Design a protein around this ligand. Structure first.
Ligand code: OLA
Length: 142
């Protein structure tokens, strides 16, 4: 007696999507209290994203008009992330039920930010909620 068989797959998110559009971002940056100049480049930064994962550890490369760095996280591993000005927040991402959670909190007053990751049709999306305001950026393959 004997038998055999085989198949194959291929992830979807593991791609290179660049900022093709955004929604409500204006209120998000305005909320924090960003200056006209800071809102000029942070709006037309041309964020280029590259998604690559190997297990429960994801690594994405992001580049902007004034800088660019690579970040690495782990599902369910809280770590300290620093900002361009030096602020350090304690946050990360973790899946729940059938959705992905992303939360980070300021050290000043503990402002809780909430972000979820999803994909619609042929465009990647990431939502961010700040004080009731829910803004998101739509990245299309580059
Ligand atoms: C020059 C103006 C100040 C720059 C504004 C910073 C805007 C965001 C840029 C870098 C910080 C990004 C922090 C994201 C945390 C991880 C979330 C994720 O896994 O997608």
């Amino acid at each position: 007696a004997h038998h055999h068989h085989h198949h194959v797959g291929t992830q979807a998110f593991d791609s290179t999507w660049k900022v093709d559009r955004s929604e409500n971002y204006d209120k998000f940056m305005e909320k924090m209290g960003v200056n006209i100049v800071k809102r000029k480049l942070a709006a037309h930064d041309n964020l280029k994203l590259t998604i690559t994962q190997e297990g429960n550890k994801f690594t994405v490369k992001e580049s902007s008009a004034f800088r660019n760095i690579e970040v690495v996280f782990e599902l369910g591993v809280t770590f300290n992330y620093n900002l361009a000005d030096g602020t350090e927040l304690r946050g990360t991402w973790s899946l729940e039920g059938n959705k992905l959670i992303g939360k980070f909190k300021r050290t000043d007053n503990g402002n809780e930010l909430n972000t979820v990751r999803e994909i619609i049709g042929d465009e990647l999306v990431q939502t961010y909620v700040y004080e009731g305001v829910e803004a998101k950026r739509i990245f299309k393959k580059d």
